[PDB]
Design a protein around this ligand. Structure first.
Ligand code: MG
Ligand code: MG
Ligand code: MG
Ligand code: MG
Ligand code: MG
Ligand code: MG
Ligand code: MG
Ligand code: MG
Ligand code: MG
Ligand code: MG
Ligand code: MG
Ligand code: MG
Ligand code: MG
Ligand code: MG
Ligand code: MG
Ligand code: MG
Ligand code: MG
Ligand code: MG
Ligand code: MG
Lengths: 57, 93, 82, 136
RNA sequence: UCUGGUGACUAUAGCAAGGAGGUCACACCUGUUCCCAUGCCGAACACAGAAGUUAAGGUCUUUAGCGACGAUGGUAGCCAACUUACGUUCCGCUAGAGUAGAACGUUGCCAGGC
RNA sequence: UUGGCACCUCGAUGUCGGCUCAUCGCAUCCUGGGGCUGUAGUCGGUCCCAAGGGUUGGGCUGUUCGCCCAUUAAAGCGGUA
RNA sequence: CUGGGGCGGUCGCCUCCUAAAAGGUAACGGAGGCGCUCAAAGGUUCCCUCAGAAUGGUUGGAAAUCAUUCAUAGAGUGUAA
RNA sequence: UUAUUGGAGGUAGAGCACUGUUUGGACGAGGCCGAAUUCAGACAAACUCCGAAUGCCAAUUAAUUUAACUUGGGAGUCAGAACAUGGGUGAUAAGGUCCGUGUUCGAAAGGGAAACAGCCCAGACCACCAGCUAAGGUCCCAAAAUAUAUGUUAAGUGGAAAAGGAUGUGGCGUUGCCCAGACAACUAGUAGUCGAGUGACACUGCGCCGAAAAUGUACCGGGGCUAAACAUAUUACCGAAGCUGUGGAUUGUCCUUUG
């Protein structure tokens, strides 16, 4: 019931909505991390800002 | 007379075409005395439905049990590869 | 370097702003404009009165709902209750 | 020289030349058909120049139709003018073929004859073609 | 339950055909002195009436032939990703239109009398 | 070649023909080698491989281009601001 | 204004399309109008339903009146859509 | 921004019921070729009985983060450009012009694309002779595999062009000819004698020709490659001013036991 997110690819050169989602998870620059409780509000966002993030557990 | 299929496990993805490279063809069944079960018959024996009656007729298939007395309802014949995909079945009851 | 033909028309009108001006669900006030058209694409319902062939506007307070009551016609009502 | 009699407005756009064919890709009339497989235009003068070459090899024997009647106009602005004062007048007509739709249907012929005659008119067209016979 | 009056339900309810009756209730007719009136005519509107008639209207029971609604599977398009200058492929979500399986000859509120 | 677009140059990038001098492609004009001819021979048509070398003197107009005279084995087509 | 300029044509309002299923959105892109009219073609209360297609009937436009039947809007709305 | 529900509108697609355009069959409508309708098919920016993906306004909705708005001083811009896609104009011509919508440059240095504002990764506070990794690569110039396994091509294709032409070469499928003995070859004018394959199609990967331009090879960047090329998978390693390790910088928040 936990997920930790990791931003692997960078954020420049991606259109204006996906660059605006990736701070709402709390990531701020590359190779950062944030630990978030599992929630179907969360796991809809990482569907949109997939192909960037590396998740686990 | 000569047909067989597996009950095609549902919610298949859009990788359904890389098994159409092998000579399969998806199909569903209808009918009075049935419920709508997607089947996966291989078209290698569909040079052997012309070889029984032609188009209008009856041939059973046996997806486990209950080999339905069926009839070929419709094609989806897409040319440029000269093949058939998504034929359909219909019981007579 | 040859004299090219004359165009004929150009000449557009200006614009008018049409369409919905409030939306399904929110809270409106008794003078506001719901929808407006050059015809009748949305009939009025209860507590909504027409204008001069335009501007379906709410009579009194409440929230708005869109609704159909025929096979093609559509209407707008406002219920003050909450 | 097949033309439309009446046309609503004489200066129109150009069709979206992508995608598959709409329909009409099953032969209905003849026994033998000729369909296309690449995506060009035909300009209302091929379609008669593929009709006169077709007729004479069969010596006007069996039935032959066409299936592609050109509807759309297309305009070419006159000889070497600068850009922009309005569209030019029409000069021909056109009907866009998608890949995989039938051009010609022939009947009243054996197989070994008509398969020659479709080839001799396939070189009069600016498209790639492929023989076909009544999907059954 | 059934007949009538007024409601809601996207024609699944309607037209198209066919058979059944009575008027305790609608009609059909009997007329125009009056109420009223046809740019004319009491066919219609209204009024005065009840000997006839179920043929018609409306009611009821069958027929899926006319329209209408309509699923599962597909294919085209397509937001996101990848590759590439090809009238492109490939992968991951949503998902029709036509066409077939068919459902369908209405449903239910409240009144007054059986 | 005739154009289309306006990207560099207006605190100047001199513009047509001709003389002087060349240099480079080959889609070859002569010469060298072949196939094929509805090629008797001598001539001739057409096509392939080939740049090594040759490619004229005058009248006319500013001319380019062009026609015309007399020859020659031939009087090639082009790029190089 | 201007695919450099004069030349030709344009200069404000109204309606579509282009315009990419909210609104918006250009070009010397494609099509049309207006610079008013109506004392009733405005307000109200009642009542009626169409152009056509047949079928016959003094006059016959093919069609100017009359009836009958099948007509869901295929007519009409002073003016362009 | 995201899930949930409810909504507005008619594009891509589809379709012919609507105004319009169409080629075929029978259908009537004079005294030897034509005049309404009906069946089977098609077309559309100004044709829609239908009709999605996405975006767009609102939930007094719940999760995560950091904005938003009102007023008052100070401006600068109103010459944009290339890519990726939906379009008009142009000739489905341009490094063209004109709109939508994104990115980057402008105003951004580094690494790759041989060099190269606009493409591909990624955002530089400064130091160090420290480690992992992205895009592209791994015989030499030049850091890293002459890695592993299956195949393919024999042209320098890789390392710039189509219509067409063709017993090139592979894995694929169907079918008719068959020790009764063909298809190669002999001798007859009825056709005999020779002992292992032959034709048609059907779909595909990789090739060849078609292929001519101007100082000098002349689009591999060069050397050079028959694997150092293409396809298919699996493994490490190099690879930036990215991220970490570490030293001190200036400002802000929070502890504030002033670290
Ligand atoms: Mg009477
Ligand atoms: Mg030039
Ligand atoms: Mg410009
Ligand atoms: Mg200056
Ligand atoms: Mg100077
Ligand atoms: Mg000077
Ligand atoms: Mg040569
Ligand atoms: Mg020379
Ligand atoms: Mg002299
Ligand atoms: Mg000008
Ligand atoms: Mg819009
Ligand atoms: Mg379309
Ligand atoms: Mg379009
Ligand atoms: Mg362009
Ligand atoms: Mg732009
Ligand atoms: Mg920036
Ligand atoms: Mg470099
Ligand atoms: Mg070096
Ligand atoms: Mg530090």
């Amino acid at each position: 019931a936990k997920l930790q997110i990791t931003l692997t690819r960078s954020v420049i050169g991606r259109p204006e909505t996906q660059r605006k989602t990736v701070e709402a998870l709390g990531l701020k620059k590359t190779n950062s991390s944030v630990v978030v409780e599992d929630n179907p509000a969360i796991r809809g966002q990482i569907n949109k800002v997939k192909h960037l993030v590396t998740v686990e557990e | 007379s000569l047909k067989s299929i597996i009950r095609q496990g549902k919610q298949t993805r859009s990788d359904l075409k890389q098994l159409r490279k092998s000579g399969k063809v998806p199909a569903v069944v209808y009918g009075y005395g049935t419920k709508n079960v997607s089947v996966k018959v291989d078209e290698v024996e569909f040079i052997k439905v012309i070889r029984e009656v032609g188009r209008n007729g009856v041939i059973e298939l046996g997806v486990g049990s209950k080999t339905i007395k069926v009839m070929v309802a419709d094609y989806q014949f897409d040319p440029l590869k000269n093949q058939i995909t998504h034929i359909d079945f219909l019981a007579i009851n | 370097k040859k004299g090219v033909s004359s165009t004929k028309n150009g000449r557009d009108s200006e614009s008018k702003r049409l369409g919905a001006k409030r939306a399904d669900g929110q809270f409106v006030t008794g003078g506001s404009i719901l929808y407006r058209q050059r015809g009748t694409k949305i009939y009025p319902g209860e507590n909504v009165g027409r204008g001069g062939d335009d501007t379906l506007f709410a009579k009194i307070d409440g929230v708005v709902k869109f609704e159909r009551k025929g096979r093609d016609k559509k209407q707008v009502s406002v219920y003050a209750v909450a | 020289m097949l033309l439309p009699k009446r046309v609503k407005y004489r200066r129109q756009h150009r069709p979206k030349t992508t995608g598959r064919s709409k329909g009409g890709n099953y032969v209905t009339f003849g026994e033998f058909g000729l369909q296309a497989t690449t995506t060009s235009w035909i300009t209302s003068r091929q379609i008669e120049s593929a009709r006169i070459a077709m007729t004479r090899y069969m010596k006007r024997g069996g039935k032959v139709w066409i299936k592609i009647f050109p509807h759309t106009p297309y305009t070419k602005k006159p000889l070497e003018v600068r850009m922009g004062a309005g569209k030019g007048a029409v000069e021909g007509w056109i009907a866009v073929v998608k890949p995989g739709r039938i051009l010609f249907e022939v009947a009243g012929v054996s197989e070994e004859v008509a398969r020659e005659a479709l080839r001799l008119a396939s070189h009069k067209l600016p498209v790639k073609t492929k023989f076909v016979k009544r999907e059954e």
